[PDB]
Amino acid sequence: YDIQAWKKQCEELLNLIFQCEDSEPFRQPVDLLEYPDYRDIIDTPMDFATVRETLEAGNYESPMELCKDVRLIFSNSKAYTPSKRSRIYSMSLRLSAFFEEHISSVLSDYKSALRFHKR
């Protein structure tokens, strides 16, 4: 029933993600010299360094907010890919499966802790 425990849990999950080779294209903003049409397709850029900095600044109130930004990384990759077989899209799908497998207990524990607080 610890309402604050999600923050360290999310820091540890982001450290695992940074150690994964599949995260390398997503650790920093997409390079516009490499992909000059990117902002014609993608309205709201996101990357894992931005997510980690927002967490460390104390600018997430809940793990739901962090999960929305991570899911935006993956939806942007799906929208920009020219093919569902592309190398960088293929990396995003494996990273998404890993993230969803680990975030489910973080979300469930936080929501249970808040319900106990409000009982």
34-93: contacts with ligand 12Q (CB under 6 A): 35, 77, 80-81, 86, 88-89
Nearer to ligand 12Q, 23 or 77 (CB): 77
The amino acid at 70: V
Nearer to ligand 12Q, 60 or 80 (CB): 80
Q: Is 1 in the site for ligand 12Q (CB under 6 A)?
A: no
Distances (CA, A) of 22 to 3, 38, 52, 110, 118: 31, 20, 17, 28, 40
Report how far residue 50's alpha carbon sits from residue 66's, in angstroms, rounded to the nearest whole number.
11
Residues near ligand 12Q (CB under 6 A): 25, 30, 35, 77, 80-81, 86, 88-89
